[PDB]
Design a protein around this ligand. Structure first.
Ligand SMILES: CC(=O)NCCc1c[nH]cn1
Ligand SMILES: [Zn+2]
Length: 323
């Protein structure tokens, strides 16, 4: 009876030296992400809308053009909603599908439904078009390194549909995509042919990005079972800062501070966390001031903060994967 599902508990990062950190900082482009990955998503894209389809096509096309061996799957399903039965489509992009373990980065790609108000449309810039674009830019910036994966551990990206409630949040009206996919993964043997382990046992850590893009975010260290990885984010931020590789950044105003948050925040990680998956929840507290407002738009995004977080996240992923 293999103990491979316990490997995540002992897994250590292979830390990047200064020259490597400079390389990663120089290898990501916030302007290229802005134009090529973010702007196409700054559209109305609630579940079932034409924008949802356009966003899904955009995400798939951007991953498909990369050199690394990404396997794309669209997870389409039905769920009851306040408006009756509807269809949803999660997007899953995986390197090395049969590898037993994967580090998983995720966000939601739907935008919350609002009827147009005074010619304004809700595009959820921080919620979560930026997180989507950050995952796409990470796949692009790290493409050559990721191509080398073509330690039975690889990378998976999940873009969840239906994170938002169609009305105001309620237990049944929210997290459509993640509740569905967590249950599906929990009931899927992994690796292929396994007798008693599932795709959830294979999830080393779920890094969920949400509500990113506003100025001065502060991310709490939510869970004891992922605290050591939160500490790695702190260390990476600190070293990138000291090497002069972050923009308009101070340690007093750092993003990963020493502070927990005992409360519960409902988000896409919940169906995974309640099935035992370790989660690093990259959601700020407090939420952006523009949260669930028509002002959650492009103009209110903080470019340098997103650039800095892209560098931090890319170093984190390379260190985790030993790349
Ligand atoms: C308020 C709460 O507990 N969860 C909502 C988090 C959220 C809203 N939009 C994106 N993420
Ligand atoms: Zn939201």
């Amino acid at each position: 009876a293999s103990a491979w599902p316990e490997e995540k508990n002992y897994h250590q990062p292979a830390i990047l030296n200064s020259s490597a950190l400079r390389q990663i900082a120089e290898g990501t482009s916030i302007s290229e992400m802005w134009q090529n990955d973010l702007q196409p998503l700054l559209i109305e894209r609630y579940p079932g809308s034409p924008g949802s389809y356009a966003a899904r096509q955009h995400i798939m096309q951007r991953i498909q053009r990369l050199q690394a061996d990404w396997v794309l799957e669209i997870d389409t399903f039905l769920s009851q909603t306040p408006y009756g039965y509807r269809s949803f489509s999660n997007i899953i992009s995986t390197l090395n599908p049969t590898a037993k373990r994967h580090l998983v980065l995720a966000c939601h790609y739907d935008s919350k439904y609002f009827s147009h108000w005074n010619n304004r449309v809700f595009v959820g810039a921080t919620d979560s078009a930026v997180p989507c674009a950050m995952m796409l830019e990470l796949a692009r910036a790290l493409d050559k390194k990721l191509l080398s994966l073509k330690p039975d551990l690889s990378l998976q990206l999940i873009f969840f549909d239906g994170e938002e409630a169609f009305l105001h949040w309620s237990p049944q009206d929210s997290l459509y995509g993640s509740r569905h996919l967590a249950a599906k993964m929990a009931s899927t043997p992994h690796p292929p042919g396994a007798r008693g382990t599932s795709q959830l046992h294979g999830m080393d850590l779920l890094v969920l990005l949400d509500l990113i893009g506003a100025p001065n975010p502060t991310f709490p260290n939510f869970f004891p079972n992922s605290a050591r990885w939160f500490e790695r984010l702190q260390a990476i931020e600190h070293e990138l800062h000291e090497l002069g590789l972050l923009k308009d950044h101070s340690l007093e105003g750092r993003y990963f501070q020493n502070y927990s948050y005992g409360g519960v925040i409902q988000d896409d990680h919940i169906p995974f966390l309640r099935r035992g998956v370790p989660v690093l929840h990259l959601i700020p507290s407090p939420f952006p001031e523009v949260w669930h407002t028509m002002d959650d738009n492009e103009e209110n995004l903080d470019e340098s903060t997103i650039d800095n977080l892209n560098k931090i996240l890319q170093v984190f992923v390379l260190e985790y994967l030993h790349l």
